[PDB]
Amino acid sequence: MKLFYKPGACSLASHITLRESGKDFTLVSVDLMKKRLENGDDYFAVNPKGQVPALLLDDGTLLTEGVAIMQYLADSVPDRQLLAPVNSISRYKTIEWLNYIATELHKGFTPLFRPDTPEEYKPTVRAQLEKKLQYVNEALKDEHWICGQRFTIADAYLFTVLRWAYAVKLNLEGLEHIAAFMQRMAERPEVQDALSAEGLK
């Protein structure tokens, strides 16, 4: 099994989930500027959308979209409780968090990473992101994980995206619950192992 990734990109969420799920895999880095692998091959021939992550299964299935990849992996190991069981309301609350992170935070940050984005527009995006972070910080008030006291694929995703707040230097003053969360997450061995393998830390 192969994870197509870029160091520190959104694909880190799927990389963490792979480690939390106990699966062996191979990491393949993608140049997103040139849409090329290290071996020179055209990445568009693997994933036509040209984005990371993508997960290629042993049987040749290609899965794209981080949220789908992460549900596929969680559903494979129900004893790990990375996602509560089908039909259980806490499952769908976890799914609610995944979609919020996907649409409101992950895609909220994207315009800061693109060349086609007008410079003059960046201050608007940053201001929007700082308000969202106020909401996330409140949601984390209980200082454990985002859903309850179980670790889930939503935590892996939120952690991955919130790293970007530090990287672009948004104003995080007094967002203490985000701080506690990031600290709890960075202590997990499976997240330390993912960060090391991507060259982060």
Ligand X SMILES: N[C@@H](CCC(=O)N[C@@H](CS(=O)(=O)O)C(=O)NCC(=O)O)C(=O)O
Which residues contribute to the annotated binding site for glutathione? 10, 35, 52, 65-66, 99, 103-106
Q: Which does 92 bind (CB under 5 to 8 A by kind): ligand X, a second copy, none?
A: a second copy
Q: Is the dihedral of CA 28, 110, 172, 134 positive or negative?
A: negative
Q: Is residue 141 part of the contact set for a second copy (CB under 8 A)?
A: no
Structure tokens given for 170: 């948004």
- CB 67 → ligand X: shortest distance, Å? 6
Q: Pick the binder of ligand X from 92, 113, 121, 166 (CB under 6 A).
A: 113
Q: Is residue 81 part of the contact set for a second copy (CB under 8 A)?
A: no
Structure tokens given for 118: 């007008």
- CB 177 → a second copy: shortest distance, Å? 15
Closer residue to a second copy (CB): 51 or 182: 51
List helix spans (H) across 21-152: 66-75, 89-100, 107-113, 122-139
Distance CA 56, CA 23 (A): 13
Closer residue to ligand X (CB): 20 or 66: 66
Sheet of 54-56, strand order: 36-37, 26-31, 2-5, 54-56, 62-64
- Count CA within 13 A, CB hemisphere, residue 80: 18
Q: Pick the binder of ligand X from 3, 28, 46, 52 (CB under 6 A).
A: 52
Q: Which does 120 bind (CB under 5 to 8 A by kind): ligand X, a second copy, none?
A: a second copy
Q: Which residue has the tokens 């940053």?
A: 126
Q: Is residue 17 part of the contact set for ligand X (CB under 6 A)?
A: no
Residues that bind ligand X (CB under 6 A): 9-10, 32, 50-53, 65-66, 99-100, 102-104, 106, 110, 113
